[PDB]
Design a binder for this molecule. Structure first.
Ligand SMILES: OC[C@H]1O[C@@](CO)(O[C@H]2O[C@H](CO)[C@@H](O)[C@H](O)[C@H]2O)[C@@H](O)[C@@H]1O
Ligand SMILES: OC[C@H]1O[C@@](CO)(O[C@H]2O[C@H](CO)[C@@H](O)[C@H](O)[C@H]2O)[C@@H](O)[C@@H]1O
Ligand SMILES: [Cl-]
Ligand SMILES: [Cl-]
Lengths: 318, 318
């Protein structure tokens, strides 16, 4: 009585003729984006499906006109029922409703419908379809991702980061001038504050990111001003959102030495850098039922990062 | 030997004639938004200033054309110098630069400029002007907020929240049906997941919020479904940003009981509420130098909140 749970939920209805097919995003997180259904008198005749990664395949042999459903990003199933043709030999009908208020019903046209099979749609996120086709749709089911506990983008790498030479724009914060009339050392306290807005963005297919709250477990590219240039350090690992912004009041206290019979000009600045670079990582979906679905992904990271506040003092003799 | 610090920085240059004026946002965080300067042969003739709260005053008596500087939100001074008229009886010139690359220089037209007085602009955020005027500008200084350590919106109240009746819109997450053909009670586990995006925002004058990173210490309006109806409670105080979004995967596991020889329909939903109400609070500015500037404020809070996920089951015979 060992019990197995799975990250997907799939119930296939119909007969056992035809040849098996499996058309799902279960290895890359792709979802069902569009479906065309053709019907006959005593069967679903054919199905054409488009997944959000651009795959497009037809099962069975179309005849007549089709019915269409176009799913928008974030649109999930709220319910699904399938019918066989009543004889156990073909799929007979598909009915569903979505979380955007849509409803779709496609059914054989001659024979009356018999036993309805209502399905659990899991999370509501449909990964595609699986079944058997020949001239017709012998059998089919819709594959759903089961309800999700967490969705994490982890194992993030930036494979061009070491090659990259970042452009650091200087922002002026303040300049102050002092003059020391006396023949003895002077010291001046200078306090600086400046609002900095650091941002991080990891791109993601919009279907997946509209449906799930993706946490990011990653290091953030950072800038420090090295004496021989600017290097993009790949910082310490922590948790973020896919689009993240962190504001603060960056501050510094400087004690400026003003020698005798000298004027000192103090110039206070900060450096700003925009990263725009590829990343790779692993999407890890953990379902409520304990199972996991993971897959490798790649995208673009965009970052805005700042140096420390910099103080430059220029001494002159008046 | 005690040491006294202050949250504003103000150095007044010129003579002692005329009458005192003080035109600053040091009681409501308003900043200098626009300035017009008129000059004469041996003086600054007049200054007209506009603060970000809509105040507008003129000091001295204009003659001739004016020079103008218009400050955009977030534009701070990076440097400032003032001159007297050389005789110590009038302000004679104003020169400044800003963090958006601007520069402005207004000076008396006949008498030569003597001693330049360079000023520490503090945070760069100019609260306004203080000085003496009669026919002319006898003396003036620009007041700055000193470098800032933190800016916090706290003591937040929503004085209409008790009168409020909230619009709750119901979103469908999933529905499923079960059938029990036995004369024996049956159980079914249904797991649910749903992405929710909760948002908070407290309005603030754009000049202040563009210059400073404002942390919010507040309770957030929250919504629960009571057996009677829909509660709107304050929440417990915590730290937020002025514009805050929090995504999560809300989840639920439900054990559904199917009584013998019954159909049971399970309808899983969540309630969404939009708040749009007034708030009051206290802005607390703590300077690097330990001093504090506090003032009361008011604005509009906008929120999106959600109830817990709800399960409603209905039963029939079959
Ligand atoms: O009804 C379709 C028609 O086609 C045939 C033979 O070409 O069978 C093909 O299609 C069936 C439905 O997809 C499959 O079950 C079968 O395996 C496949 O050869 C006829 O047998 C059938 O009547
Ligand atoms: O500066 C012009 C002229 O104004 C007079 C009055 O005619 O003085 C007024 O303006 C001065 C500059 O603002 C003030 O110092 C003075 O207090 C005020 O009465 C003249 O004295 C002066 O020459
Ligand atoms: Cl059947
Ligand atoms: Cl002078």
């Amino acid at each position: 009585g060992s019990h197995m749970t799975y990250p997907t939920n799939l119930e296939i209805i119909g007969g056992q003729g035809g040849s098996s097919f499996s058309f799902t995003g279960e290895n890359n997180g792709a979802s069902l984006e569009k479906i065309w259904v053709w019907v006959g008198g005593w069967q679903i005749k054919a199905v054409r499906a488009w997944l959000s990664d651009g795959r497009d395949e037809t099962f069975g042999v179309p005849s007549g006109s089709h019915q269409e459903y176009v799913f928008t990003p974030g649109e999930c199933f709220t319910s699904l029922s399938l019918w066989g043709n009543g004889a156990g030999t073909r799929l007979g009908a598909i009915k569903f409703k979505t979380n955007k208020g849509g409803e779709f019903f496609a059914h054989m046209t001659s024979w009356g419908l018999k036993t309805e099979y209502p399905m659990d749609v899991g999370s509501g996120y449909c990964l595609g379809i699986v079944g058997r086709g020949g001239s017709d749709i012998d059998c089919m089911g819709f594959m759903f991702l089961n309800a999700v506990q967490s969705t994490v983008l982890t194992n993030v790498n930036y494979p061009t980061i070491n090659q990259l030479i970042p452009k650091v724009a200087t922002e002026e914060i303040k300049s102050v001038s002092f003059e020391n009339k006396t023949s003895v050392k002077q010291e001046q306290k200078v306090e600086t504050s400046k609002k900095v807005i650091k941002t991080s963005s990891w791109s993601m297919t919009k279907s997946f990111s509209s449906t799930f709250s993706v946490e990011v477990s990653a290091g953030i590219p950072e800038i420090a001003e090295v004496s021989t240039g600017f290097s993009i350090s790949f910082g310490v690992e922590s948790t973020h959102s896919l689009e993240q912004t962190d504001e603060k009041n960056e501050t510094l206290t400087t004690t400026v030495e003003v020698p005798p019979k000298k004027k000192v000009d103090v110039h206070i600045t900060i450096g700003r850098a925009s990263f725009d670079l590829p990343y790779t990582g692993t999407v890890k979906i953990t379902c409520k039922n304990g199972s996991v679905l993971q897959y490798e992904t790649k995208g673009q990271y965009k970052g805005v990062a700042y140096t420390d506040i910099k103080v430059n003092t220029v001494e002159k003799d008046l």
